[PDB]
Coordinates of C-alpha atoms in Angstrom, one line a residue:
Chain A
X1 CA 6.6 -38.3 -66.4
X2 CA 7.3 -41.3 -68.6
X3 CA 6.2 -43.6 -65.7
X4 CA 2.1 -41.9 -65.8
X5 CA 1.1 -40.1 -67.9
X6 CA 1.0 -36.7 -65.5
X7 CA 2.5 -33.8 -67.5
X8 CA 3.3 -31.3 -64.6
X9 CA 3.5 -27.5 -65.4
X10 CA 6.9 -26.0 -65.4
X11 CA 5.9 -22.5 -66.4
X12 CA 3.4 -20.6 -68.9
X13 CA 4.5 -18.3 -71.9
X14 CA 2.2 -15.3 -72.7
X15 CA 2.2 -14.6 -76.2
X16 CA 3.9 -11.8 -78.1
X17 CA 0.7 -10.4 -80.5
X18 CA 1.0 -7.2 -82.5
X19 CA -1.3 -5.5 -79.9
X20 CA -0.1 -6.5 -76.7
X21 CA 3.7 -5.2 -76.4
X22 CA 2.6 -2.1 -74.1
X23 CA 0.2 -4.2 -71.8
X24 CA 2.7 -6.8 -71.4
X25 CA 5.1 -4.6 -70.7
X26 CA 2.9 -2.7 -67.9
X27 CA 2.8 -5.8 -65.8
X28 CA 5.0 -7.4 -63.4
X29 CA 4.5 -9.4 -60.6
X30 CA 2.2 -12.4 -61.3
X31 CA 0.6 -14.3 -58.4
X32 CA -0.7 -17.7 -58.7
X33 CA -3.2 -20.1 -56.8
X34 CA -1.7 -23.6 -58.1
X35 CA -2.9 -27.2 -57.2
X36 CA 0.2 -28.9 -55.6
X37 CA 0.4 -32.8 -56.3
X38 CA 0.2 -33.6 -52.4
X39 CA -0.8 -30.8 -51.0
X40 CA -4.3 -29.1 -52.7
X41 CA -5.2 -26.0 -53.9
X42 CA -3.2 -22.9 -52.5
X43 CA -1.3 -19.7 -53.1
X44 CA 2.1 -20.6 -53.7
X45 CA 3.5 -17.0 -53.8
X46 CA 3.8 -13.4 -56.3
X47 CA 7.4 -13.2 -58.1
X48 CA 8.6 -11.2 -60.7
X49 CA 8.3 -12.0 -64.4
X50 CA 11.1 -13.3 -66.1
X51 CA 11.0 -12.4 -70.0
X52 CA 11.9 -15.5 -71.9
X53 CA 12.4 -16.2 -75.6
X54 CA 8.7 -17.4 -76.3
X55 CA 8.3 -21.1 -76.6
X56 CA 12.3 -21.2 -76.6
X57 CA 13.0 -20.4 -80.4
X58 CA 16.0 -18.2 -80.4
X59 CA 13.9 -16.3 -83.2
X60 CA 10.7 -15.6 -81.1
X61 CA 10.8 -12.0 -79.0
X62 CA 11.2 -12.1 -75.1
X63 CA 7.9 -12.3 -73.3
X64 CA 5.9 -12.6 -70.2
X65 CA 7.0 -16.0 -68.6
X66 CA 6.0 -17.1 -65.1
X67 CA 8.3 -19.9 -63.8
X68 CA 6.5 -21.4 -61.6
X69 CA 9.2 -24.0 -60.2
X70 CA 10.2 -20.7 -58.6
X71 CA 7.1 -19.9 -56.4
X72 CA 6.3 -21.4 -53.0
X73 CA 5.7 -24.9 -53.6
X74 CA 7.7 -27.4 -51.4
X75 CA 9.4 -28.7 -54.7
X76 CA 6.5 -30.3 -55.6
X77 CA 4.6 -30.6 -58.9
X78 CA 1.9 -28.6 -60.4
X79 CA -0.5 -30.8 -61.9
X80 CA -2.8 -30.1 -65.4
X81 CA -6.3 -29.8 -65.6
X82 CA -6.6 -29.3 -62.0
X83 CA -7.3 -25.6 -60.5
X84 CA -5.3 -23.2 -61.5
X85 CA -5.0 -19.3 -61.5
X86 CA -2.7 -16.7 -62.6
X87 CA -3.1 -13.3 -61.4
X88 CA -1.7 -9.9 -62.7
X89 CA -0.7 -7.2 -59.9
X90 CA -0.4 -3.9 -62.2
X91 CA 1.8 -1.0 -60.5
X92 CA -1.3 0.0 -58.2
X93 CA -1.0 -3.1 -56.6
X94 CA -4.6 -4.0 -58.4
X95 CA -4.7 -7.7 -59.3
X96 CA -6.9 -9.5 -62.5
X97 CA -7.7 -12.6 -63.2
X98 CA -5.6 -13.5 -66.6
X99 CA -5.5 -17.2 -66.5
X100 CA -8.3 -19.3 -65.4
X101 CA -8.2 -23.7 -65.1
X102 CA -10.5 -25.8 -63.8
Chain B
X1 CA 37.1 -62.8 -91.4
X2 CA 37.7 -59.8 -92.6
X3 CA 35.7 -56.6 -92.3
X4 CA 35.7 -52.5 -93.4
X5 CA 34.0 -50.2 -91.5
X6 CA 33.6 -46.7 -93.3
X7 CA 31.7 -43.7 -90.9
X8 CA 31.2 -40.1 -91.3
X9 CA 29.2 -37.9 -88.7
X10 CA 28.6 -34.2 -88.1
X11 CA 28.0 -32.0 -84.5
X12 CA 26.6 -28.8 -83.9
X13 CA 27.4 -27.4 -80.7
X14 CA 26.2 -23.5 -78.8
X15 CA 27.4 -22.6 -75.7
X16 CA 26.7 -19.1 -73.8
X17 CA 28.9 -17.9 -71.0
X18 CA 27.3 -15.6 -68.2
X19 CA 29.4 -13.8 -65.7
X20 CA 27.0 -13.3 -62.5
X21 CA 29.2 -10.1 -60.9
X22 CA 29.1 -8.3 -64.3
X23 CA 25.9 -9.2 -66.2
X24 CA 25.2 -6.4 -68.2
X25 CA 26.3 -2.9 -68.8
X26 CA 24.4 0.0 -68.0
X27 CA 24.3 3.4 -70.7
X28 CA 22.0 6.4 -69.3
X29 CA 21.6 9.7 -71.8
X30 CA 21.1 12.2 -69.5
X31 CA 20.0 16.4 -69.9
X32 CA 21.8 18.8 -67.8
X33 CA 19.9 22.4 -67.6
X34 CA 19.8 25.2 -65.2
X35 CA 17.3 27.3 -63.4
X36 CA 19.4 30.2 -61.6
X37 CA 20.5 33.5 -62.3
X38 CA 24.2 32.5 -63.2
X39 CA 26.1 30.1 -66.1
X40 CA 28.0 27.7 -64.4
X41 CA 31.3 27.0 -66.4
X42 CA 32.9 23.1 -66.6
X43 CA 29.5 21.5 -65.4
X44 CA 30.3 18.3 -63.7
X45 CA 27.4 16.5 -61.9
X46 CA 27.4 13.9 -59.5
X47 CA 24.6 11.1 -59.9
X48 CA 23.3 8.6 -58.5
X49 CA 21.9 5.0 -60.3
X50 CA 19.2 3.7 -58.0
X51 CA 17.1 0.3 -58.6
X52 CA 15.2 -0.6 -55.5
X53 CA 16.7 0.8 -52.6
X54 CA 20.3 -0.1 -53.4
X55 CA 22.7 2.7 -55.2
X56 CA 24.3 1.2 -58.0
X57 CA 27.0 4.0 -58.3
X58 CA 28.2 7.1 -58.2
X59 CA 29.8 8.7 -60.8
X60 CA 30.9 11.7 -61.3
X61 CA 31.4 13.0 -64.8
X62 CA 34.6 13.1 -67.1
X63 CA 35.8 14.6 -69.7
X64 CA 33.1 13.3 -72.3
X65 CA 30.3 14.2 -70.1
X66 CA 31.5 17.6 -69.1
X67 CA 29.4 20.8 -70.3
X68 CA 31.0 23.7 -71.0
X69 CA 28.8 26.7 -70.9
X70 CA 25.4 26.6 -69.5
X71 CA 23.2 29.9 -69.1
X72 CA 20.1 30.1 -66.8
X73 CA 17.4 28.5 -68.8
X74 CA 19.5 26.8 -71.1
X75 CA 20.4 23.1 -71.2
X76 CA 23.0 20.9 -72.1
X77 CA 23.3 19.6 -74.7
X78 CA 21.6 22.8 -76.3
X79 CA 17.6 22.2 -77.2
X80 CA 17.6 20.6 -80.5
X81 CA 20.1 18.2 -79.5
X82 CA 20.4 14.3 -78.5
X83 CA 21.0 13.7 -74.6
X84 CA 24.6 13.0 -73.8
X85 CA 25.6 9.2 -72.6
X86 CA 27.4 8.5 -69.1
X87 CA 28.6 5.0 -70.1
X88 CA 31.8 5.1 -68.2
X89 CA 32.5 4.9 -64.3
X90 CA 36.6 5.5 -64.0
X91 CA 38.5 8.5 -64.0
X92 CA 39.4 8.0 -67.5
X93 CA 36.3 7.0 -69.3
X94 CA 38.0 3.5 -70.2
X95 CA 35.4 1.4 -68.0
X96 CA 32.0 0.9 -68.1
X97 CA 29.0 0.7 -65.4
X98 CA 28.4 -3.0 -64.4
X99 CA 25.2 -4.9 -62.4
X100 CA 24.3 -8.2 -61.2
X101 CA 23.1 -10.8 -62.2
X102 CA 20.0 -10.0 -59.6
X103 CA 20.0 -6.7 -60.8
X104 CA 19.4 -7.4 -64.4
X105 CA 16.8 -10.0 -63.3
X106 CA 14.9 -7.1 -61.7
X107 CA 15.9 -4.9 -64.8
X108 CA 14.1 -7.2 -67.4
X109 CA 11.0 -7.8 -65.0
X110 CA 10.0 -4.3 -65.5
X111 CA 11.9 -2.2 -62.5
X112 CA 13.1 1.0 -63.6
X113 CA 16.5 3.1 -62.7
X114 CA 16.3 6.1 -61.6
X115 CA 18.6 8.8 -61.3
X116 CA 19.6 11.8 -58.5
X117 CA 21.8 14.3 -59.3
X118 CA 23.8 15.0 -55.7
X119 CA 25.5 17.3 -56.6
X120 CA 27.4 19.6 -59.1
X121 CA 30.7 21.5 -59.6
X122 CA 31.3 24.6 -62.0
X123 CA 33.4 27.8 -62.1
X124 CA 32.3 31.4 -62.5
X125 CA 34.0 34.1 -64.2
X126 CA 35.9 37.2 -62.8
X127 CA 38.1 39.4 -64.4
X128 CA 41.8 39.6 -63.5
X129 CA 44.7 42.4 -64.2
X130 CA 43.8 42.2 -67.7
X131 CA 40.1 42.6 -69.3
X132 CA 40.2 39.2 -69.8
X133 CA 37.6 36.9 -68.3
X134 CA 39.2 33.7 -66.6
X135 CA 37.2 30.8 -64.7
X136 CA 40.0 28.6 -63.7
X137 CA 40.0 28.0 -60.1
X138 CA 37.1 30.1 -59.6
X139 CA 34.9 27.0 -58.1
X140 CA 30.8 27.7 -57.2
X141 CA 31.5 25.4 -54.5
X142 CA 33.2 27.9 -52.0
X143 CA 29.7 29.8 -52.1
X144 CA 27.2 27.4 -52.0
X145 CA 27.4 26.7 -48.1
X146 CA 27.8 30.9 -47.5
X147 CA 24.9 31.8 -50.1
X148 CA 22.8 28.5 -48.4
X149 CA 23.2 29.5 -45.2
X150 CA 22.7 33.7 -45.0
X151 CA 19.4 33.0 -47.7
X152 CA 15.8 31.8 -47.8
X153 CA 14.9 29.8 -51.2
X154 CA 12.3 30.6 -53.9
Chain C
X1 CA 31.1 -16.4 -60.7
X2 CA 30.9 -18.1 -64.4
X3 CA 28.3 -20.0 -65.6
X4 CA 27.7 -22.2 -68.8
X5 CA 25.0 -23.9 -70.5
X6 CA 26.2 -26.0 -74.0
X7 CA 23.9 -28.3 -75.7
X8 CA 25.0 -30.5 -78.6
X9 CA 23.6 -32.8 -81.2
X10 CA 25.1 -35.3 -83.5
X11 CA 24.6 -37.1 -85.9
X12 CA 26.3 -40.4 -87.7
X13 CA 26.2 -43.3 -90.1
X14 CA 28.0 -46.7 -90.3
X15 CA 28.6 -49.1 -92.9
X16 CA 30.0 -52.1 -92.6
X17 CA 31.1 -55.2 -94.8
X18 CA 32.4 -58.4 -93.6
X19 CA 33.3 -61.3 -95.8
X20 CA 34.0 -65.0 -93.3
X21 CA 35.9 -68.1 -94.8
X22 CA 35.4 -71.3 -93.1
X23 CA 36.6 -75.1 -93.5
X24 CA 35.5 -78.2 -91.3
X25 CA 37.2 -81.6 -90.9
X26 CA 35.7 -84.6 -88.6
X27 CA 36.2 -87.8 -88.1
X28 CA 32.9 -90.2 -86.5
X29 CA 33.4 -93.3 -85.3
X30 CA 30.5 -95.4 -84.4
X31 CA 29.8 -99.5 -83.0
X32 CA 27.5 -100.9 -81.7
X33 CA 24.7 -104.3 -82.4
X34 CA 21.7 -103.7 -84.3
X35 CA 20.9 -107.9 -85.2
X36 CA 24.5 -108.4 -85.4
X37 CA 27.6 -106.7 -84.5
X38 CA 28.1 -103.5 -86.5
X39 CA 31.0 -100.7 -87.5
X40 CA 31.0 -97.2 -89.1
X41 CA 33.9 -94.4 -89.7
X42 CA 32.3 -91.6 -91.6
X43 CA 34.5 -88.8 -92.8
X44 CA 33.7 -85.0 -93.2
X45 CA 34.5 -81.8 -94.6
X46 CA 32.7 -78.5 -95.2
X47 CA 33.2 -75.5 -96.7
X48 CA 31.6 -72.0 -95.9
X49 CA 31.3 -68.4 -97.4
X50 CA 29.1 -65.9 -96.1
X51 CA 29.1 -62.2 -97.0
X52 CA 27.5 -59.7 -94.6
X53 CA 26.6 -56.1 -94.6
X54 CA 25.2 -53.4 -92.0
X55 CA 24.0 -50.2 -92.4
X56 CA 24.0 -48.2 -89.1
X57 CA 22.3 -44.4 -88.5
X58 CA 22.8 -42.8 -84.9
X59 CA 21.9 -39.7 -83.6
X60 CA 22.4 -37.9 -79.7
X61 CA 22.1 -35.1 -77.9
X62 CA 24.2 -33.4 -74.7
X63 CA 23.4 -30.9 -72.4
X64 CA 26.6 -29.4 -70.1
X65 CA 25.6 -27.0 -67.4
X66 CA 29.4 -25.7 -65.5
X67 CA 30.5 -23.3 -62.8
X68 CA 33.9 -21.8 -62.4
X69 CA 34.8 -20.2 -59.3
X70 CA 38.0 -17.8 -58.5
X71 CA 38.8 -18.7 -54.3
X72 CA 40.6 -15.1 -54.5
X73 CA 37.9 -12.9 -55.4
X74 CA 34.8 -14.9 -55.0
X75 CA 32.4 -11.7 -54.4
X76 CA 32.6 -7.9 -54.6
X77 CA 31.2 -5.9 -51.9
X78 CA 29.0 -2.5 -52.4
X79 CA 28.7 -0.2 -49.3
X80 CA 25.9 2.5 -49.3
X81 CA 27.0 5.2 -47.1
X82 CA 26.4 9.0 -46.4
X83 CA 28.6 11.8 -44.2
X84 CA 27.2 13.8 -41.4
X85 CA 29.0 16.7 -39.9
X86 CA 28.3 17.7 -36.5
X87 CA 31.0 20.3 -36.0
X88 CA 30.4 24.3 -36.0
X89 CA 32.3 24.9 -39.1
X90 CA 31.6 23.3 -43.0
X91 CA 33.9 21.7 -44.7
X92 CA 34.8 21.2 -48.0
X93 CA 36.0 18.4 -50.3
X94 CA 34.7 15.6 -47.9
X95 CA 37.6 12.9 -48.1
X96 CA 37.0 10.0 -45.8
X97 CA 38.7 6.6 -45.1
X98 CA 36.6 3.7 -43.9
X99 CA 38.0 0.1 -42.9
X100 CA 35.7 -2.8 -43.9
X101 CA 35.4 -4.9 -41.0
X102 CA 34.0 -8.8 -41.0
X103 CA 35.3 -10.6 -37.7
X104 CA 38.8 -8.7 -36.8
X105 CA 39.9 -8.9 -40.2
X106 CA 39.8 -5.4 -41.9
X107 CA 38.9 -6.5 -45.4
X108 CA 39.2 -3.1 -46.9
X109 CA 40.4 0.7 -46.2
X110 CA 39.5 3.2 -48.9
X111 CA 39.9 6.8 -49.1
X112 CA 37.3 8.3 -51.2
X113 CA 38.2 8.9 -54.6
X114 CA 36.6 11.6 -56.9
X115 CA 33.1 9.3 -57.1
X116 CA 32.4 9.8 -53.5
X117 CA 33.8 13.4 -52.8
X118 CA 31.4 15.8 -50.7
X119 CA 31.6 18.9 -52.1
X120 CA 29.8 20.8 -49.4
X121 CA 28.8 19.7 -45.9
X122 CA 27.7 22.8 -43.6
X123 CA 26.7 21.9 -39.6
X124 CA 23.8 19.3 -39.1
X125 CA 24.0 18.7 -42.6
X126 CA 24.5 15.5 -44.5
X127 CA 26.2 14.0 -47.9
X128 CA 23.9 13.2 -49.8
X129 CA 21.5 15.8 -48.8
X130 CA 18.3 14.6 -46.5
X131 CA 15.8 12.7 -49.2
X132 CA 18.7 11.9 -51.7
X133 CA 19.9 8.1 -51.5
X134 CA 23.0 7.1 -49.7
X135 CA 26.4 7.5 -52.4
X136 CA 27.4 3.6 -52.9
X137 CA 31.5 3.1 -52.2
X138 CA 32.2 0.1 -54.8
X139 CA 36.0 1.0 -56.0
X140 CA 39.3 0.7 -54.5
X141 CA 41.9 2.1 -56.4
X142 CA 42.9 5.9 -57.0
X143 CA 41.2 6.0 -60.3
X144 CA 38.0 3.8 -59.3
X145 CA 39.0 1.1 -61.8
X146 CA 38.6 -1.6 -59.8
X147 CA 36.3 -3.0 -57.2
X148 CA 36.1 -4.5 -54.2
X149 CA 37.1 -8.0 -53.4
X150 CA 36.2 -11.1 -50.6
X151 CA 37.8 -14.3 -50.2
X152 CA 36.1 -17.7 -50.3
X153 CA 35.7 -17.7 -46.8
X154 CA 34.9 -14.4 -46.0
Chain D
X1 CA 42.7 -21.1 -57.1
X2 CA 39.9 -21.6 -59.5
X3 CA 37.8 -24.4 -59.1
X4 CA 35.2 -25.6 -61.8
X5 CA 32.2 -28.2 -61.5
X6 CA 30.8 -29.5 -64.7
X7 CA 28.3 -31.8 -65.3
X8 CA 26.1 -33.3 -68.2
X9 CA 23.5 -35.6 -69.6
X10 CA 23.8 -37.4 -72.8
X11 CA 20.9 -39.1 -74.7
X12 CA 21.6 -41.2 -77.8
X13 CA 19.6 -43.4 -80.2
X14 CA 21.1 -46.1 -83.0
X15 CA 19.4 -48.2 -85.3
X16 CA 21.1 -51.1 -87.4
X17 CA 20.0 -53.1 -90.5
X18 CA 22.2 -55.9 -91.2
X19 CA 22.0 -58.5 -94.3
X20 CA 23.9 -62.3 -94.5
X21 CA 24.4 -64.5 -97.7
X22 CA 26.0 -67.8 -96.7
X23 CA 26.6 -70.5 -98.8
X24 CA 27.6 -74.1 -97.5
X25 CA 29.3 -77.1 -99.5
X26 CA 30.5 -80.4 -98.0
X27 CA 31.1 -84.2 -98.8
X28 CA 30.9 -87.1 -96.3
X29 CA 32.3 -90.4 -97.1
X30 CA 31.1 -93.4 -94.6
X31 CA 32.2 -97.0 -95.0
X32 CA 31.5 -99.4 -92.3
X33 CA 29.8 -102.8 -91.8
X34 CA 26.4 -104.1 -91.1
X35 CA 25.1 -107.5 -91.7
X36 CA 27.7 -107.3 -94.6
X37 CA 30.0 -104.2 -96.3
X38 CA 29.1 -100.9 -97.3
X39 CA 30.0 -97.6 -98.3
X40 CA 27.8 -93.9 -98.5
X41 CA 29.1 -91.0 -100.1
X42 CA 26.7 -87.7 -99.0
X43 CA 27.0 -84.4 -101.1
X44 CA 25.0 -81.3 -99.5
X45 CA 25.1 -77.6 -100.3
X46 CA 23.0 -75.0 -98.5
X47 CA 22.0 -71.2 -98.7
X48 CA 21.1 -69.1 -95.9
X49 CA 19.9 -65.7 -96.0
X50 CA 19.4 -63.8 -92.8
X51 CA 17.9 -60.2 -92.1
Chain E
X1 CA 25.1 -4.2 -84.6
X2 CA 21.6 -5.8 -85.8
X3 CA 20.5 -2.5 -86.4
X4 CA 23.4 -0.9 -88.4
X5 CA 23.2 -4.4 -90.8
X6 CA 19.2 -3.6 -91.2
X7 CA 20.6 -0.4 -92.9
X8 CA 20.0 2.1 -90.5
X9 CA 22.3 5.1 -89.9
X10 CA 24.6 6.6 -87.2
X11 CA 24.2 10.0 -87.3
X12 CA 26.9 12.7 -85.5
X13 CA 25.8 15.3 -83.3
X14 CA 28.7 18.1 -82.2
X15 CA 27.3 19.5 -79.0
X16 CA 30.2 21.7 -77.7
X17 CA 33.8 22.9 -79.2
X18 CA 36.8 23.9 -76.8
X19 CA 39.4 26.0 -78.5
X20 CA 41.5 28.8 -77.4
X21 CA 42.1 32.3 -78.8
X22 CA 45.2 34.3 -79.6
X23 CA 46.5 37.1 -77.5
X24 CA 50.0 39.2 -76.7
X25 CA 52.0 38.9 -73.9
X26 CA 54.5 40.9 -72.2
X27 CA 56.7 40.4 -75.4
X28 CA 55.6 40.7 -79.0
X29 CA 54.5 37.2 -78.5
X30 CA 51.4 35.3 -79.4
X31 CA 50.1 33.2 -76.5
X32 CA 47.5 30.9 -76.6
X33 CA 47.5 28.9 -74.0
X34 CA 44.9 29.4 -71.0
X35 CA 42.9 31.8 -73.3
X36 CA 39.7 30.1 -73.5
X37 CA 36.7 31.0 -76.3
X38 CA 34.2 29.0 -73.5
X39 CA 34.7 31.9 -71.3
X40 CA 33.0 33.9 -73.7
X41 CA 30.4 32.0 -75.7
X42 CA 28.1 32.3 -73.1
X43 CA 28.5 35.9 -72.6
X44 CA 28.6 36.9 -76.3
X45 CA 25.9 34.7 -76.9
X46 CA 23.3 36.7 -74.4
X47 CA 23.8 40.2 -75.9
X48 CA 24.0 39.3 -79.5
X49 CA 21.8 38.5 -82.4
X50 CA 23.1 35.8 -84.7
X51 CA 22.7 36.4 -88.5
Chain F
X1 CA 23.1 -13.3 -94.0
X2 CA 25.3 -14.9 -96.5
X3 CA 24.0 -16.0 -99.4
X4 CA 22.5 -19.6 -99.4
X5 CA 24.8 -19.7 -96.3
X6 CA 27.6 -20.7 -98.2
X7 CA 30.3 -18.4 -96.6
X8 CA 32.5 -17.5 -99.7
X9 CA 28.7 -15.9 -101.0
X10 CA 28.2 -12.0 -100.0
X11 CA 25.3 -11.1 -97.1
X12 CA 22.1 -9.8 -99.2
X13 CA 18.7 -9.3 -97.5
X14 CA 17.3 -12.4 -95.9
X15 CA 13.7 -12.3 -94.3
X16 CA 13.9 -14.7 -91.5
X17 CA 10.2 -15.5 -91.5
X18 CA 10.9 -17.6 -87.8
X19 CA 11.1 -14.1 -86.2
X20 CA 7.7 -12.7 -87.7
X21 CA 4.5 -13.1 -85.5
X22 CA 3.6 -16.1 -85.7
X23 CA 2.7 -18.4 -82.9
X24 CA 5.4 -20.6 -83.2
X25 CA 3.2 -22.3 -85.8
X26 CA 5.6 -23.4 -89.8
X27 CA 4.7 -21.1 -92.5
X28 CA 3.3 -23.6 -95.5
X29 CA 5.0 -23.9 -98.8
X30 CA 2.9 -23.8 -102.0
X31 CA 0.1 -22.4 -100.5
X32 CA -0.4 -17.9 -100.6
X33 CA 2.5 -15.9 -99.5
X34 CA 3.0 -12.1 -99.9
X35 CA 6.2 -10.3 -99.1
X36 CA 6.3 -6.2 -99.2
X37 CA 9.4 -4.5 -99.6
X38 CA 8.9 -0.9 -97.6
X39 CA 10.8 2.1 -98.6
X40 CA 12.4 4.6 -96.4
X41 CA 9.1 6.8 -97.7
X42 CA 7.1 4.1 -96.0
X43 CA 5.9 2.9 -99.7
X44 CA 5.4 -0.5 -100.0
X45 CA 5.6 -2.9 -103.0
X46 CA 5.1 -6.3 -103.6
X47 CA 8.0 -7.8 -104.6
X48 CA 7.3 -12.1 -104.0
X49 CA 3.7 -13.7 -104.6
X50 CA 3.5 -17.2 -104.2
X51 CA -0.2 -19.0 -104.4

């Protein structure tokens, strides 16, 4: 936001290493706790993942991308280095922590 | 006054066009094989493409997916071999097997397709007038409700 | 539907060079009493040249997001469906016709082309078979080439 | 029918560096009279030089 | 297409052959139409030994 | 690609190094790079050092 200096999250990229292409591949399904701008700190949903090109380069590999402008917030913004947690469901429907903010 | 004004600029432009009732094109390689006590001539399956709940299609196979011969315990295409594509849904193999734009969006977060055979048609061979074996018209499907009916299954 | 996404970027550069020309003429008369009545006329003329240049660099960027949409077709429609025969005798080479109904309006009737064909369905029996998934009905035409259209409205 | 809806955003950015020489030449000629007759001939040139 | 330009290869697999055989008519005459080897393959295939 | 992208030039091998695994981060010039040609026999060989 040019106005203040804010910088809301749109979405997080998870990287493409040469070890992680079969674990990224195992999960769908991320759920996320976020910190809404007027509201506080909630669960705003569990969607798919999406697979974009990683940071946007048409060169970099399709990974992991969780948009979060998609989950359950009431169009509001997701605010930086407030609360913020990302969860993994595998197939078994058991959940891990993979992103942590505070 | 008098002025001249020389310019010279360059653009780069990319574009991508997406068509949200036929997003992407579907190519299964599939393995036929068979567990009874009989070949079934001119094997043509009947399948199923399944993403969540919702049947993509039906198709049943042509002429480039159609297996000839195939003896108990066999399989075609014969052990050794590469599966066979079904890439086509027409009668004619001239059109291929489209999805959504919502169905590729589950495709690349991980969902899998699965297919179901539902059914299958084949001949079996007699021998007519001559010694000759023919299995033209000679369709399994006139016996699988008698034999399914009048049998218990092991 | 079609969508698009373009993005552009340019890039220019502008010189210019001017070259201006001017001439004055005036004329001031002046009276007035200073210790004595008093009189001027003074008479002017100028001459000026200026040369000019500038040097201009530009650069943008677009972005163009579209959506085309045919009022004819604007959807096609997928029906997941499955046969049931509650008669005392089987029958063979299933062939139904189905009208698509929204309001009053019958969208759609399709006899089953060779996609969607039962081969076998004995008494209390069912097509696909009990734990198969329903057969989806997605063409029209004789040789299931194309699919199944909706208005804008509809 | 078909029936289309575009829309787009443009963002652009120029910067100009301009340069003037002028030069400037005149003569003025005043006569008049003031506790007697006179007369003034004035000869200015100039330069300007503007960024 | 990415692939076949890194220099990889397409290879061809034959999987099955139709083709029909030559037999005699009524007449003196070679007919082979309807006289299919597929009817046969399988059954020569399961009491032979292939050398 | 085509050579120097000049389209009259033939396409020879070109290592786009912007689809390696980086994380997005530039690849530095004068400073130690290693390219390794690998052979169908999965034998490698060094075929550009830069340091």
């Amino acid at each position: 936001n040019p106005s203040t200096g804010n910088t809301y999250i749109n979405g997080m990229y998870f990287a493409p290493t040469q070890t992680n292409k079969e674990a990224l591949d195992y999960i769908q399904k991320y759920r996320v706790e976020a910190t809404l701008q007027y509201s506080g700190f909630k669960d705003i949903g569990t969607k798919d993942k999406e697979m974009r090109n990683y940071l946007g380069d048409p060169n970099q590999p399709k990974t992991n991308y969780v948009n979060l402008r998609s989950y359950f917030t009431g169009g509001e913004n997701i605010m930086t280095y407030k609360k913020l947690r990302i969860y993994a469901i595998t197939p078994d429907d058991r959940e891990l922590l993979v992103l942590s903010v505070d | 006054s008098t002025a001249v004004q020389d310019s010279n600029g360059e653009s780069w432009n990319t574009g991508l066009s997406i068509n949200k009732g036929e997003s992407a094109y579907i190519n299964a390689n599939v393995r036929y094989y068979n567990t009874g006590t009989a070949p079934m001539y001119k094997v043509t399956p009947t399948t199923n493409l399944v993403l969540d709940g919702d049947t993509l299609s039906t198709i049943k196979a042509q002429e480039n997916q159609i297996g000839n011969n195939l003896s108990p315990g066999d399989t075609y295409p014969k052990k050794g071999l590469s599966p066979l594509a079904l890439n086509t849904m027409d009668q004619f193999s001239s059109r291929l097997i489209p999805i959504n734009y919502d169905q590729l969006k589950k495709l690349d977060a991980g969902k899998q397709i699965k297919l179901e055979t539902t059914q299958v048609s084949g001949n079996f061979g007699t021998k007519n007038s001559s010694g000759q074996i023919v299995t033209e018209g000679n369709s399994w499907s006139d016996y699988i409700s008698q034999i399914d009916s009048i049998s218990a299954s092991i | 539907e079609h969508a698009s996404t373009d993005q552009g970027k340019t890039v220019s550069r502008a010189t210019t060079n001017s070259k201006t020309e001017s001439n004055t003429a005036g004329v001031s008369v002046n009276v007035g009493y200073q210790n004595g009545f008093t009189a001027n006329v003074t008479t002017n003329y100028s001459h000026t040249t200026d040369n000019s240049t500038a040097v201009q660099d530009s650069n943008g960027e677009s972005w163009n997001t579209g959506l085309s949409i045919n009022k004819g077709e604007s959807a096609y429609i997928n029906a997941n469906v499955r046969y049931y025969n509650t008669g005392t005798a089987p029958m063979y080479k299933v062939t139904p016709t189905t009208n698509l109904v929204l309001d009053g309006d019958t969208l759609s009737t399709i006899k089953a082309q060779e996609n969607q064909i039962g081969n076998n369905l004995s008494p209390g029996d069912t097509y696909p078979k009990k734990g198969l998934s329903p057969l989806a009905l997605n063409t029209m035409d004789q040789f299931s080439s194309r699919l199944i259209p909706i208005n804008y409205d509809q």
